[PDB]
Design a protein around this nucleic acid. Structure first.
Ligand SMILES: [Mg+2]
Ligand SMILES: [Mg+2]
Ligand SMILES: [Mg+2]
Ligand SMILES: [Mg+2]
Ligand SMILES: [Mg+2]
Ligand SMILES: [Mg+2]
Ligand SMILES: [Mg+2]
Ligand SMILES: [Mg+2]
Ligand SMILES: [Mg+2]
Ligand SMILES: [Mg+2]
Ligand SMILES: [Mg+2]
Ligand SMILES: [Mg+2]
Ligand SMILES: [Mg+2]
Ligand SMILES: [Mg+2]
Ligand SMILES: [Mg+2]
Ligand SMILES: [Mg+2]
Ligand SMILES: [Mg+2]
Ligand SMILES: [Mg+2]
Ligand SMILES: [Mg+2]
Ligand SMILES: [Mg+2]
Ligand SMILES: [Mg+2]
Ligand SMILES: [Mg+2]
Ligand SMILES: [Mg+2]
Ligand SMILES: [Mg+2]
Ligand SMILES: [Mg+2]
Ligand SMILES: [Mg+2]
Ligand SMILES: [Mg+2]
Ligand SMILES: [Mg+2]
Lengths: 72, 85, 60, 43, 97
RNA sequence: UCUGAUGGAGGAUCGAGUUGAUACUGACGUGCAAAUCGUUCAUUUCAAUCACGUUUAGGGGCGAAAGACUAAUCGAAAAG
RNA sequence: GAGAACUUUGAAGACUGAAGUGGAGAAGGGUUUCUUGUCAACUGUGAUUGAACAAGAGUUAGCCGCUCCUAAGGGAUAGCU
RNA sequence: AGAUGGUAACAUAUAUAUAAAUGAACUCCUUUACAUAGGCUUUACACUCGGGGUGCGUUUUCUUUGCACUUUACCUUUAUAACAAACCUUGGAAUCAAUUUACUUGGAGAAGAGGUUCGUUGAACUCAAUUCAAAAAUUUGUUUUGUAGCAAUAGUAAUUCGUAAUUAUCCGAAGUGGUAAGGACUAUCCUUGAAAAAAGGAGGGAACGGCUUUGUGCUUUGCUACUCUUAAUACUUGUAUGAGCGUACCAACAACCGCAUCAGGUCUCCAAGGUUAACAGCCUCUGGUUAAAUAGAAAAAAGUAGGUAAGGGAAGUCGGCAAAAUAGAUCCGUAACUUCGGGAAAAGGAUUGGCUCUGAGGACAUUAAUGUUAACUCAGAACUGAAACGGACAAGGGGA
């Protein structure tokens, strides 16, 4: 499992066709934190956002053939 | 306080083994556990590894030599003769 | 013969047999539980309980 | 123990099979039993 | 900093007398190991169904619960009642089932 | 050449365990046991102990030697 | 349950006392595991219990092992006896 | 036809993924790959302490209380940090210096100053992100997140609601040093403590673009996308991904060996609290049993495993056999003799509880004084008791 910090890199990864599923998790922080996981054939890449709206926007951006798993 | 009068290195042996034997050991143990002068680096660091093998800590040059001393007399004599020749 | 049930409870709960309290009222109900699922159900109900750990106080 | 050769395992299985009693229906048309504790297979 | 006791359920069955409880709390609550203080450091007031404890000093919710338990023991209400946490600041009496 | 520290040598010291088996010539001796039990005892950084693997086979082996041991069998195993 | 000192459950009182009748494995055992039955014998007292008896079931690996390497060693090839 | 950086130690490919830094014959190394002892240190685990949160327990009296839970895996060359080493640059050391618990080290270059690497470790560090603001061709300041990802969705303890779902929790300091591992060392040896498969590195410089045309794999002539490199995809070639075997259970207490459900024997790891030097012994928590080829009643002799005994104290007996006494620690004192090492715990004395105090022993960080704060150990003094205190357990009898 890997972490991602460059949003652009994440986007690129998403664009790449072996990325079957996205996992999008909501977490009550000690505000609503959001973890964006992409499930690639090789690795499970995750991005952490402090900011909900940004997270939402990025989710929206994600290709609509991704197999989105809303965990909690 | 200097602990042992006569014994020195053979205190490890304690009461056991003849006094004569311990006396003999003493010479040889002194010879063994001395740091000898290394003929290459100069430093008195050649201590004994195995029996006939003497490693300088400084330069790491293993000199073959005596079992107890670094140089036996016979060997030295031989060397001298060769040099003369 | 509640042996079996006790054993199952031990695993399910994570406790030693020495620690399972099977209610002497409704020994009939419990004996009917031949499964881990049933034991869990029983536990949920309160026909099986993990006993309280014997106390070892550091106080003294 | 818990690591047998295949051959040994097969032999064990065979022995177990041998152990079981006469099928009762036959009796209408055994002395070689062995109990695991008292008589060994001596493998 | 407020800590609360939602005393309703047994108060509305008469079994809990809030005035007595308040007094007990006042008596009990040690500050640096002495009961009689409660000066600028601690306050206790009471609604009909609720005790309010307001604290400046390092003070644990555990202590309140303990006090409640003690009170219950004193007035024999132990097999009927139970102190349980509602919100972080808020303890509440609940009936044993 | 003394004094105080340091240092941590030794088939050193005591000692649980382990490995044994000194005494009680205790118990047992138609036993729990074809050698056990109890308490006492010796052993514990080395010639130490243990496991597994491996070598050595009968007038042969192996023996810090007791004619010990060599599958309850030994001043010559066992099987036929 | 026909029947209970030694089957089960609960309540006591105790012991083992992390050099353990605790958890894991090796050798050895070989199904003793497991459920449902169950009592002729056996379980040196009883027994409804059981490691007994009967019927069924149960052991899932690219990663844990073996499998490969070499060790003390062994069996052979060439010869030679 | 085969990258660059860095004075150097050496570093650099961050593409989904550090894949790619030409290399043949033939060589040479290294890894694999190693004893025992001794302490020192580092980390994890365990244990503990104090605080916050949850529940249960105690409550005649007392107790801000006693107990439980408060979790975090491989994997990501994990990124970084810190640290023992090793090396590099600079620097030029006797008034020797640095330095370890120990000694080690230095003109063959020390200290100091700045670096590089491996190794521990595996989120330490502002580590990463983001917040916005200022300076160059990107670095500084402030804030908010993230149990760094794995990861909370899982566990745990709760709380409800239903006949599976919701909620709230999961976190701020530290000590002890039992176990393990690593490190750097030091010491002992007439003892110097396996090998190979496999892998790697180096040395070396064999061989060298592609397509089209001509002549007998080689030579000549003309043109410029080439040589690698991972990943995917397609297509023919036998069907182009993971073979086989073991995995139940016992491991002695009734599954093993002792003719048996035999007080015997049988290898390895884990290993809690208290008392303590102690993994001893005694007691306790987790886990385990409450069983053992019998139970009950009586309670004589005799037996066996124990106790105790006035006065004497070996008179017993082959013989102090057996038992008793002795014992832990601290302080004192310690002879003959001696191979000068020992003897030696010689012999022989004293003290030891509980309580209430006193003194001695660190770390850090403000600016010599003032702070926050930690073990556990030592030493001394009061009082105290039916003069007792290594109160049980454990633990030399000594001498000639
Ligand atoms: Mg076998
Ligand atoms: Mg047998
Ligand atoms: Mg004898
Ligand atoms: Mg006898
Ligand atoms: Mg007799
Ligand atoms: Mg024999
Ligand atoms: Mg019986
Ligand atoms: Mg006990
Ligand atoms: Mg006992
Ligand atoms: Mg069974
Ligand atoms: Mg019987
Ligand atoms: Mg059965
Ligand atoms: Mg059977
Ligand atoms: Mg493997
Ligand atoms: Mg081969
Ligand atoms: Mg060989
Ligand atoms: Mg041959
Ligand atoms: Mg959860
Ligand atoms: Mg198993
Ligand atoms: Mg037995
Ligand atoms: Mg036999
Ligand atoms: Mg068990
Ligand atoms: Mg028995
Ligand atoms: Mg007398
Ligand atoms: Mg006398
Ligand atoms: Mg007489
Ligand atoms: Mg006499
Ligand atoms: Mg005696």
């Amino acid at each position: 499992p890997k972490q991602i910090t460059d949003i652009r890199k994440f986007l690129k990864i998403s664009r790449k066709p072996d990325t079957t599923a996205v996992i999008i998790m909501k977490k009550k922080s000690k505000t609503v934190i959001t973890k964006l996981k992409l499930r690639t054939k090789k690795y499970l890449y995750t991005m952490v956002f402090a900011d909900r709206k940004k997270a939402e926007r990025i989710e929206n951006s994600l290709l609509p053939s991704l197999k989105r798993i809303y965990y909690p | 306080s200097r602990r042992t009068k006569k014994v020195g290195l053979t205190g490890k042996y304690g009461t056991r083994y003849g006094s004569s034997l311990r006396k003999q050991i003493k010479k040889i143990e002194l010879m063994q556990h001395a740091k000898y002068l290394c003929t290459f680096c100069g430093k008195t660091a050649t201590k004994r590894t195995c029996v006939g093998i003497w490693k300088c800590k400084k330069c790491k040059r293993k000199v073959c030599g005596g079992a107890w001393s670094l140089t036996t007399p016979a060997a030295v004599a031989a060397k001298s003769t060769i040099i003369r020749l | 013969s509640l042996t079996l049930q006790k054993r199952l409870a031990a695993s399910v709960l994570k406790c030693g047999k020495n620690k399972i309290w099977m209610d002497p009222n409704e020994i009939s109900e419990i004996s009917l539980a031949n499964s881990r699922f049933s034991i869990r159900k029983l536990y949920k109900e309160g026909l099986i309980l993990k006993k309280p750990q014997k106390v070892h106080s550091r106080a003294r | 123990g818990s690591i047998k050769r295949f051959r040994l395992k097969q032999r064990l299985g065979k022995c177990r099979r041998q152990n079981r009693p006469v099928p009762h229906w036959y009796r209408l048309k055994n002395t070689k039993r062995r109990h695991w504790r008292r008589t060994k297979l001596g493998l | 900093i407020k800590y609360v006791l939602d005393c309703t359920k047994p108060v509305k069955d008469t079994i809990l007398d809030i005035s007595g409880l308040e007094q007990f709390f006042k008596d009990k609550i040690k500050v640096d190991k002495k009961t009689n203080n409660l000066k600028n450091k601690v306050v206790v007031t009471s609604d009909e169904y609720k005790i309010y404890i307001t604290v400046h000093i390092p003070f644990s919710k555990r202590y309140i619960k303990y006090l409640a338990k003690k009170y219950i023991k004193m007035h024999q209400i132990r097999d009927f009642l139970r102190v349980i946490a509602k919100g972080k600041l808020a303890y509440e009496f609940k009936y044993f089932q």
